[PDB]
Design a protein around this ligand. Structure first.
Ligand SMILES: [Zn+2]
Lengths: 85, 125, 60, 116, 99, 205, 134, 49
RNA sequence: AAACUUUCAACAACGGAUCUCUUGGUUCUCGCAUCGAUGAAGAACGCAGCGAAAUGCGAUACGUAAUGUGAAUUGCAGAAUUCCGUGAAUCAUCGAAUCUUUGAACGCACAUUGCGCCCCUUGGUAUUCCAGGGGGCAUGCCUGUUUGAGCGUCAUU
RNA sequence: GAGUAGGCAGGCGUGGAGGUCAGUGACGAAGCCUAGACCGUAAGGUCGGGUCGAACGGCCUCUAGUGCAGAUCUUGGUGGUAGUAGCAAAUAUUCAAAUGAGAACUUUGAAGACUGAAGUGGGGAAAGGUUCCACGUCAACAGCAGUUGGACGUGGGUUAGUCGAUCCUAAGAGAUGGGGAAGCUCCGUUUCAAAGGCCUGAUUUUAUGCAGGCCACCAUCGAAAGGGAAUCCGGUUAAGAUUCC
RNA sequence: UGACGUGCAAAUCGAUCGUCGAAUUUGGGUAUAGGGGCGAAAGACUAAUCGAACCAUCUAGUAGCUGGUUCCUGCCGAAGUU
RNA sequence: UGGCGAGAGACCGAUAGCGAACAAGUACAGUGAUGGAAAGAUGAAAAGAACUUUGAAAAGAGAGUGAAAAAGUACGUGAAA
RNA sequence: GUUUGACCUCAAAUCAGGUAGGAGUACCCGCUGAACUUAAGCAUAUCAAUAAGCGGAGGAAAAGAAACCAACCGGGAUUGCC
């Protein structure tokens, strides 16, 4: 009874998609994500999770803003434009 | 090497060449000038642009000449007019030549090339 | 049958069609496709035959 | 397409009239693309819309810099970004202000230059 | 786990020492950094020595009192004797020890 | 942490498989594979090499100097110079001393012209004929070409001679004061062909 | 005292660490008071706290804070330094009078373990420092 | 489920658009290491969410 | 004696070792200090003449503006001699912008593309209802403003 | 002149390193194959023949991630068993034409059957996610087959004032004030809180000040089966319809 | 104590049987989380895992115990006792 | 043992070296936390095989390209079972 | 009992201007905190004032110009190496 026949009754969802993590981790009864800890100020990430930290660290995504911070520094946070010569 | 900011690393030099963008592949795909053109201008070698006429100096196609069609920067080649291979089917396809195995027999002169020639130190246009 | 944006009210489809194509809209019925784009069935009043405005746009 | 150096020499309403014409010109080209096998001319139109919109944004933004010129409290988008930390950081007047006593000491006994 | 006949050793390696071994490969690299650091400081402090005039001082601890050695700073008594100010001394390149 | 990045408990005994840490359950190929071993495909090597290995070696300053002194003494008798390759079968008298003018040579063509006239070109064409490719993996580790060792031009005062000879393939240039053993006896084989200057040969004493 | 937050007093260790009740917090009540105000008013910087009053279940402190954003403080040289972001949450890192006390930052033989920093001192004299020539 | 949330419909819609084999003109290009679409998913083989 | 089994060779298979390479790793050294309410890191969804991705970008969407270079792109198509040029480029540089929906995430919610309110303006005849466009409305705390509360409290009347 | 455990010595072989043989090499390096040869007690070395196509070696020294048959070793590949076990429960198929290279399996016709309205019927819930439908097509999959398909390639398709969601509360979950806690956060949801909203005209100062005055133990989330404003018929598509007409 | 037992199936199949209007059966929602829950009590159940779940980390835990431990030749050559 | 920019090596050389030399924290498993692969080499140049003939077709045998097809996109070499 | 005005303490506002969170974390400042293990057993000890957990910074951080060391013919902030 405990195996194949009991596997047949798995037709609900413990978690759906998280708003922040975007991953089927948002436990819908607790109403908190089991990966990013949403809703919470802090993103769940533990030192004992070496791989898990690496999977969601900086540089996994686009870095829309941080990409160019290196270039902007290098130039001295300059403002305006050059004209011609 | 005495300047420390340059690298004698084979790995770095191979990657820096292969991942060179278009604007620096201009300078990598350079060709030397003819004895006559070097006597005229007084400049050793230039970056091949589109409609320069050249002579082939190495390879199976050695001795043939004409205007360059396509500076195929993405393939590190320059395809020359009249230097083609006819396939079995009877359709012609241009042969990929490296510009350093060619010689610039005739220059394509515009304001930016006159500027380039004067900058290196050519005694004309 | 016009491919409308997402974030576009039936009001905004009616107002858009009237302003652009110069036609009085009797109704607008919108479904979102399995493609994930919206489409809207812009029915006109009896005054305008839809073929006159279909040919005006270009497509036949 | 259209050149942006030509568009900088036009009124507010000439640009608006050029934009609506380009938006109609994309609309009719989007209609032709339905019947035509490959229509790559739509690219130049939608890049020309972006060129005009950028020139309109740039000109309204210059007008708003001119109306807020020579005051405190500029809009936070018009303030120089640099970095949160660099904005927080003490200015050149701050981090340079010294007490009357410590000023008098430096005037009296500055570090001097000697030889041998 | 005890010798044939060997001196009893005290090797203090029962912690995670492997996690805080510090090998000094940086020795040669630091040496040129310190020389460059001195050369640039002498370019900054252009005509003046890198070090200040230290006083002579007899070493403490009777083992070592038999030899004199360059102390930290002169004194308010020695500065007044020599005929200058403890403020003026510090600026024109003399270490002055208030202690 | 190489081969250690996985989580793997052994399955113990009772599964007819041999007791090595095995990978966490999945549909992936990696699941149920050996881990952490030196035997396993993707474990950590037996006693992984660490950076606190003794690289450098201290040797007594007096032993160093003994070796340097004996190496300089071998630059004399030709038996050892010819034993160490070095084509000096034709050359006039051993330890080869030149004028103080060789120190003042600025340009390479005159520096090499000076060396050839003094008696070389047999040992300086060796270093041109020598240039072969390396025999192993060292080619893609910036050790591509071999190039034999030619003469050592030891001087007293530098008036541009080190720059002059720098490019010339095989020739090495040294100051008398320093005088490296690594150059005085390459390969730990005695008797290098050394050209002394007049100033340098007097400064040796 | 600080009651150990272990549930049902069960610690899961060896007798030496079966203590629950008689255990003391290593920071002071001044430090706890500084810490909670630091969290409440995050925009300001804790200059110094001190004792005011106490009963049996309470101790009463008055934390002197400073506004690092107010020009008044940013323009005066004697209190310009506090604005520098290396002084952000002094009370938390333990750089206030209370923290320096609780970290035994004092000169002398008395403070050999904790003078330059207990952790810094421990790792320094548990560091194996090898040279190129041994 | 016939009564989908729009958040599920949007993701079904992206999964539909993604379900195609590699366009057979990209195999023609320079250096092109790519052979076939590796991230191809069927409704039978493997589920999502 | 055939077939059959075993061994060896040649050639052919299966398979992917050996050898050779290597735009990758690794360790060492040196140099530098730059994330975020001016909305970060991360997530979602979109965007090309033909693209599922990786890479790039955000309804201005494999990009816009500026600057440099000086003539391309490339798989095909499509163009274009603007090519003695304010000018090709899947180029470099990057100082002006755009930056959807989210997110510390901030109107209130959120297993919903859910439900409000304030201002300006535009239409329906419209202070109030409905709809379009634009601008807003989180919390703690500091300084200052304004309006207040309390026989807590003073003086005058 | 034996020899396990064991010690020591002399060598053989591998990846690199310094030196040397002005070493070999596209007229063919290395690798691999060889019932051919020679040397060595041996570890091994050398040569001929083939294949192959870009490097490699002798010697004197340095260095080590340096030599495999076993570890129910690791990864990858391969077998014998073996064309074997088997592919046998849900009663059952058969004739003809068509199509096609090919038909037990496809389409149609004709029989014979079964499920027997607590069904093998007709809808839905959760779950799936385009499987729906059309055309083209069969290398892979459907443990036989395949012209067929829930496969493969390219497209088409889901229309709402009335159906649901949206709203309300349920067991409950939860901000707030507050209080605990070193802190992550924990308690509590009406509490030892100063906890905003409602309407009438007003008065017409390009529309703003009144008062008729009232009323207050007070977030929010929580049901696609509970509560609940309102739709029916006929027709329509390849595939939608209480929606389209 | 039938079938199957390298199965249809990591618990099914067939016959026979218990009970069948309540201490009944059951969907959705919700609460209880690991020395904890829950238990009409079998140490039962708590995602095929239960006399203390699962995941990662400390961790390469320790092992007087088992197994393995990779070229040749030469010379010497043991112990099972105190 | 982080981030950015550079130099290096008696290091590793595709079962090695980082888990990742490739659209790698990708595909995929599990409700979840988390677990987590395999996968580089035609040739100088696609010159990627015109055209003929058998077959329904895939393909075959020719012809050709190539320095080699004992290099055919099942692609350097191609061991052993 | 009024007239008006102060003061003190506490409030309100979508009040003028501002600031806090989150990320990262190799190194740094703190808090909290084990067990494996070692002891040939094991409870103090040990691992270790370590891992894990939490709060907080910077290019460095922290420290630091003595309520110091000493006992000398006395040294003289801080940190680092020998
Ligand atoms: Zn999440």
């Amino acid at each position: 009874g405990k195996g194949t026949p009991s596997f047949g009754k798995r037709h609900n969802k413990s978690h759906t998609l998280c708003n922040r993590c975007g991953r089927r981790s948002f436990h819908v009864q607790k109403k908190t994500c089991s990966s990013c800890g949403y809703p919470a100020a802090k993103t769940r990430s533990y030192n004992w999770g070496a791989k898990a930290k690496r999977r969601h660290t900086t540089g996994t995504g686009r870095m829309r803003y941080l990409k160019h911070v290196s270039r902007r520094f290098k130039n001295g946070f300059q403002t305006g434009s050059a004209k011609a010569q | 090497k005495q300047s420390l900011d340059v690298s004698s690393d084979r790995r770095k030099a191979r990657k820096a060449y292969f991942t060179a963008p278009s604007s620096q592949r201009r300078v990598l795909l350079s060709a030397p000038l003819s004895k006559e053109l070097r006597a005229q201008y007084g400049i050793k070698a230039l970056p091949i642009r589109r409609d320069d006429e050249v002579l082939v100096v190495r390879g199976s196609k050695k001795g043939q000449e004409g205007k360059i069609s396509s500076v195929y920067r993405l393939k590190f080649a320059v395809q020359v007019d009249k230097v083609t291979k006819e396939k079995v089917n009877g359709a012609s396809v241009p042969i990929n030549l490296h510009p350093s195995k060619l010689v610039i027999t005739k220059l394509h002169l515009d304001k930016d090339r006159k500027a380039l020639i004067q900058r290196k130190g050519g005694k004309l246009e | 049958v016009f491919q409308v944006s997402m974030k576009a009210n039936k009001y905004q489809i009616k107002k858009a069609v009237k302003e652009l194509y110069e036609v009085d809209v009797l109704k607008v019925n919108t479904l979102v496709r399995p493609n994930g784009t919206k489409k809207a069935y812009v029915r006109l009043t009896a005054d305008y035959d839809a073929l006159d405005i279909a040919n005006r746009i270009g497509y036949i | 397409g259209v050149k942006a150096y030509e568009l900088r020499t036009k009124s507010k309403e000439q640009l608006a009239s050029q934009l609506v014409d380009l938006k109609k010109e994309l609309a009719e080209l989007k209609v032709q693309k339905l019947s035509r096998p490959s229509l790559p001319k739509i690219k130049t139109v939608r890049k020309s819309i972006a060129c005009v919109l950028t020139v309109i944004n740039e000109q309204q933004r210059e007008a708003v810099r001119q109306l807020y010129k020579g005051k405190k409290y500029q809009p936070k988008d018009l303030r120089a970004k640099k970095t949160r930390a660099l904005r927080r950081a003490l200015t050149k007047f701050e981090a340079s202000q010294v007490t009357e006593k410590q000023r008098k000491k430096q005037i009296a006994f500055p570090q001097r230059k000697y030889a041998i | 786990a005890i010798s044939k006949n060997l001196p009893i050793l005290k090797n203090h390696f029962r912690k995670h020492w492997q996690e805080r071994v510090k090998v000094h490969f940086d020795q040669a690299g630091k040496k040129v950094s310190r020389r460059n650091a001195r050369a640039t400081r002498a370019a900054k402090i252009a005509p003046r020595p890198l070090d200040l005039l230290r006083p002579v001082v007899r070493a403490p601890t009777v083992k070592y009192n038999r030899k004199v050695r360059a102390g930290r700073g002169f004194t308010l008594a020695e500065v007044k004797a020599a005929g200058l100010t403890a403020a003026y001394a510090r600026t024109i390149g003399i270490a002055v020890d208030h202690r | 942490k190489a081969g250690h990045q996985t989580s793997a408990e052994s399955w113990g005994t009772g599964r007819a498989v041999a007791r090595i840490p095995r990978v966490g359950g999945g549909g992936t190929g990696r699941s149920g594979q050996g881990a952490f071993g030196n035997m396993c495909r993707g474990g950590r090597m037996f006693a992984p090499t660490k950076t606190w290995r003794k690289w450098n070696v201290k040797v007594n300053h007096n032993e160093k100097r003994y070796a340097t002194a004996s190496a300089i003494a071998a630059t004399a008798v030709a038996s050892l110079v010819l034993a160490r390759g070095h084509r000096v079968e034709k050359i006039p008298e051993i330890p080869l001393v030149v004028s103080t003018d060789l120190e003042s040579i600025q340009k390479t063509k005159e520096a090499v012209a000076a060396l050839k006239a003094v008696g070389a070109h047999s040992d300086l064409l060796k270093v041109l004929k020598s240039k072969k490719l390396r025999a192993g993996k060292g080619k893609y580790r910036n050790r591509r070409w071999t190039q034999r060792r030619g003469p050592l031009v030891v001087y007293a005062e530098d008036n541009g001679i080190v720059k002059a000879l720098r490019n010339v393939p095989g020739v090495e240039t040294a100051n008398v004061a320093s005088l490296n053993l690594l150059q005085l006896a390459p390969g730990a084989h005695l008797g290098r062909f050394v050209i002394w200057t007049e100033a340098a040969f007097t400064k040796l004493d | 005292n600080r009651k150990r937050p272990v549930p049902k007093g069960a610690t899961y260790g060896k007798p030496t660490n079966q203590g629950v009740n008689e255990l003391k917090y290593q920071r002071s009540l001044r430090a706890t008071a500084e810490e909670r105000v630091g969290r409440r008013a995050a925009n300001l910087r804790v200059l110094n706290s001190y004792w005011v009053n106490q009963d049996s279940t309470y101790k009463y402190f008055e934390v002197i804070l400073v506004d690092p954003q107010h020009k008044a403080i940013r323009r005066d040289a004697r209190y310009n330094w506090i604005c520098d972001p290396v002084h952000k949450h002094r009370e938390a890192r333990g750089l206030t009078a209370t923290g320096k006390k609780s970290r035994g930052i004092n000169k002398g033989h008395k403070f050999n373990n904790t003078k330059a920093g207990r952790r810094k001192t421990w790792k320094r004299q548990n560091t194996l420092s090898l040279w190129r020539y041994r | 489920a016939a009564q989908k949330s729009f958040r599920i419909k949007q993701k079904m819609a992206k999964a539909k658009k993604q379900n195609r084999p590699l366009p057979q003109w990209i195999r023609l290009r320079t250096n092109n290491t790519i052979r076939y679409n590796a991230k191809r998913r069927n409704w039978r083989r493997t589920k999502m969410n």
